[PDB]
Amino acid sequence: NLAQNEEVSFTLDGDKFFSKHVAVVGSTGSGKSCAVAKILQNVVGINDARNINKSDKKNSHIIIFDIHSEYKSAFEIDKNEDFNLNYLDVEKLKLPYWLMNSEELETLFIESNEQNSHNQVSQFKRAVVLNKEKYNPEFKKITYDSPVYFNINEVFNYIYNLNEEVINLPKLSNGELVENRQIYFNEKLEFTSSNTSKATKASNGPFNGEFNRFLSRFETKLTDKRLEFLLLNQDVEENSKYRTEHFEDILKQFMGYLDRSNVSIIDLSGIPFEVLSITISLISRLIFDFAFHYSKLQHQKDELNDIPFMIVCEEAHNYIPRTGGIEFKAAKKSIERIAKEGRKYGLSLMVVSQRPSEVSDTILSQCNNFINLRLTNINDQNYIKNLLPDNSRSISEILPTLG
Amino acid sequence: YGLSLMVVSQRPSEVSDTILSQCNNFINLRLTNINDQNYIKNLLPDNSRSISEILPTLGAGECLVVGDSTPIPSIVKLELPNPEPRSQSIKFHKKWSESWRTPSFEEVIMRWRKENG
Amino acid sequence: PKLSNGELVENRQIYFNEKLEFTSSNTSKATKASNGPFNGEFNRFLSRFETKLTDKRLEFLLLNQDVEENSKYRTEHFEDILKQFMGYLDRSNVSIIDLSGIPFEVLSITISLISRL
Amino acid sequence: YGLSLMVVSQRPSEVSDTILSQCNNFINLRLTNINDQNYIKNLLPDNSRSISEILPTLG
Amino acid sequence: HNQVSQFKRAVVLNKEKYNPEFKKITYDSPVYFNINEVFNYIYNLNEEVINKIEGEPSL
């Protein structure tokens, strides 16, 4: 209802509002979360804690990137009204680590708080691609960026075979002269000493004595409970139940199609600050790929997307900052991917934030609708007023005077 | 060498000045951004800086022409093209008014990889 | 440079045809080996370069010459190409260049190429 | 997280602007430096600019 | 740059040696690291001499 007159009903053009990006910024105390929740209940069909869409389930799609777990009650209703919510907390989230491109894998495993040693990134890359090839023989082209299943434990055991003491033709001190190195992944293995010689050379490995602390940090990662949502600890059966043929199931639970939930909250409260960007980028990349393939498949029949996706980004000033370090590179890349393109393939981003003066302009300059609440910071006011397509003596004077 | 430019932009304030200043003739439609207003005012010749104040008020289908080719600035009404230009954009609201429609979510994943990758 | 099999390479030009395996660094005198000036300095460069080559959405650039029949194109495959942009093949008077499906990170490069041509 | 700031200074033009802008309420005593008064005026909420002209006079 | 790298390396080494139980020994970790042997570590790096006699490895 209009602020000036409470009897007149105020309405917009819905087809021109959600189909394009919207920026939602403001300040604490003005109910910015209040406005977001009201718009969300209006669009999904929550009215007076009751679902209008009882008999039939409307095709409303929403995925939310939550960092507080302060939006669950915005859609948690009594069960009798049949409005299910796909609550994806840190515990229930299942994101395989083998659908993960080169940069993300390297940043997750290889990158450390120190300076890396030579011939470490290359060796790990070779181990991962070789294990991908070994586990997936059916697939023709297997590369470092190929999303195919592999075991991180086998790669660790390969790096655990740092201790080569018998070769600088194979000379391995397993059995007598074992040739194939594929047994490296199966077991940790034990070799003999260097105080011996034969027809060939029996001295230290070319990589000998250079991965030691890399094994220390790496195995520390392999036994991390906070990172349990990557299915990293593959020893347990449930972590190994998901395979290349199971890429289907892990993606339904993002779309909520496993439980036909119109709203899919992805609660990222327990995600470590070191792996948050990788998670955001992976989810964004897979959503964009799904939308791209889905749209391109339907061009043959001469119609566009049937299931549009709507993504909201709770305080996105963190992972797409205006200025920042290398921590949030992949998240920025993926959010830019869905920002610049996604109108063609059926994707819309309603980014929400508290500080719009600290969010990257490469994503803020593309929202065709804005709902800004009360502002207290002057640079916030100036930046918002400059970004707004229409501001003529009536929009530039109201931002601080809001209630 | 037979190359001249004509620029089409929603926000003239963001296009680099290295080209917009090279334009001699202008087709100015309705504008609602003060920065665009001022930037256009600055680039326009002084002969129309008085009539240039009408830019926030051009009705639908009306454009203001300023430059050398026209003898004097004028407001020209433009006839609709035939066939009309249309973009196959997706509007989200009607697709959200329908029931749940499964993608069958199999052939898309098959299309992810053309043969094997 | 010394190969793993021991054959010294006199011409580096063999690198073009295939990849080659080398020997290991040794501090002794009978088989002394030293790392090259560019040893291990292109690992991230190589990874990103393979990532760019293996992209399926960038097929218009014809980057996968190794397995596809994209090596057919030559210096001989030429100005009949140029006439496609400008429309002399079908005698089209309007050269519309749609760039909706082009991925965003290669849009500027393609625009620059067409403009310079 | 349960931590807040109540900033105290005599030269607001010298304190970094990226914390003073975080302050929501103000306790303004007499100010005699014009460069500080202009800053405190520009940082204040709009409803208080008219009443803020008392700062040089408060005693 | 070399000073920063050497100092952080020495601090990490001392922190790891004196705190074996902790795993993610980082340069910001609030664990004990004595400065006398860090200064000594810089001293010995500044005065180290490598042996290049043939046969034995260069240590």
Render C98-110 in DSSP notation, one character per residue. Answer: --SSS-GGGHHHH
- Helical spans, DSSP H, in chain E: 2-18, 36-47
The first and second tokens of residue A168, run together, are 């600088």
Q: Residue A79 carries which DSSP code?
A: G
- Strand-pairing partners, residue C8, are C2
Q: Which of A223, A99, A103 is nearest to A156 (CA)?
A: A223
Cβ within 8 Å, pair D21-A377: yes
Which chains touch E (3+ CB pairs under 8 A)? Answer: A, C
* Secondary structure class of A313 (helix, strand, coil): strand
The first and second tokens of residue E11, run together, are 């601090």
Q: Residue B60 carries which DSSP code?
A: T
Q: What is the widest separation between alpha-carbon atoms in chain E? A: 45
Tell me the CA distances in angstroms from A80 to A50, A85, A147, A198, E59, one per residue in order.
10, 13, 41, 79, 76
CA angle, B102 then B107 then B109, to 5°: 95
Question: Helix A212-222 crosses helix A152-160 at what angle (to 10 degrees)?
Answer: 160
CA angle, B42 then B45 then B48, to 5°: 100
Q: Find all residues with CB under 8 Å of A393, minimum gap 6, and list them.
A: none
Asked if residue D40 lies in contact with residue D55, where contact means CB atoms within 8 angstroms, the answer is yes
Q: Confirm or reject contact between A118 and chain C (CB < 8 A).
A: yes
Task: For tokens 């070769």, name the residue.
Answer: A167
Cβ within 8 Å, pair B111-A296: yes
Q: Which of A330, A389, A326, A336 is nearest to A359 (CA)?
A: A336
Question: Would the CA dihedral through A62, A64, A69, A74 be positive or negative?
Answer: negative
C-alpha–C-alpha distance, residues A205 and A208, integer Å: 4
Q: Find all residues with CB under 8 Å of B114, minimum gap 6, and list them.
A: C56
Q: Residue B54 carries which DSSP code?
A: G
C-alpha–C-alpha distance, residues A372 and A220, integer Å: 45
Query: Residue A50: in which H helix or E strand, if any?
Result: strand A50-51
Overall residue count recorded for chain B in this entry: 117
C-alpha–C-alpha distance, residues D26 and D12, integer Å: 12
Distance of CA E49 to the CA centre of its chain: 16
The first and second tokens of residue B8, run together, are 């089409």
* Touching, E vs A (3+ Cβ pairs under 8 A): yes
Q: What are phi and psi of A162, to 5 degrees?
A: -40, -45
Method: cryo-EM
Q: How many CB atoms lie within 10 A of CB A340?
A: 15
Contacts 24+ apart (CB under 8 A), A177-184: A182/A134, A184/A157, A184/A158
Burial of C90 (0-12, 13-18, 19+ CB in 10 A): exposed
C-alpha–C-alpha distance, residues C107 and D10, integer Å: 54
Query: Residue A134: in which H helix or E strand, if any?
Result: helix A121-135
CA angle, B55 then B57 then B63, to 5°: 60
Q: How many CB atoms lie within 10 A of CB E1?
A: 5
C-alpha–C-alpha distance, residues A106 and A104, integer Å: 5
- Where residue A124 falls (left for φ over 0; alpha for ψ -120 to 50; beta otherwise) is alpha
Q: Which of B94, B98, B108 sits opposite A294 (nearest CB)?
A: B108
Residue type, E10: A
End-to-end CA separation in angstroms for chain B = 48
Cβ within 8 Å, pair B115-A16: no
E 12-31: CB under 8 A from C? none
From E49's Cα to the closest Cα of chain A, the distance in A is 22
Asked if residue A179 lies in contact with residue A151, where contact means CB atoms within 8 angstroms, the answer is no
C-alpha–C-alpha distance, residues A249 and A243, integer Å: 10
* Secondary structure class of A305 (helix, strand, coil): coil
- Residues of chain C in Cβ contact (below 8 Å) with chain E: 27, 29
The first and second tokens of residue A93, run together, are 């989230």
C-alpha–C-alpha distance, residues B19 and B37, integer Å: 17
Question: Would the CA dihedral through B67, B69, B74, B76 be positive or negative?
Answer: negative
Q: Which of A141, A99, A64, A98 is nearest to A286 (CA)?
A: A99
From A268's Cα to the closest Cα of chain D, the distance in A is 18
From B106's Cα to the closest Cα of chain A, the distance in A is 8
C-alpha–C-alpha distance, residues A3 and A56, integer Å: 34
C-alpha–C-alpha distance, residues A236 and A230, integer Å: 13
Instruction: Please report residues of A whose CB lies closer than 8 A to that of E26.
Output: 113
Cα atoms found within 13 Å of the Cα of residue B3, Cβ hemisphere only:
4
Q: Residue B64 carries which DSSP code?
A: E
Instruction: Please report residues of A whose CB lies closer than 8 A to that of B89.
Output: 19, 343-344
Q: Residue A101 carries which DSSP code?
A: -
B62-66 and B26-28 strand pairing: antiparallel
Q: Residue A119 carries which DSSP code?
A: T
Q: Which of C24, C51, C100 sits opposite A206 (nearest CB)?
A: C24
Nearest CA in chain D to A400: D46
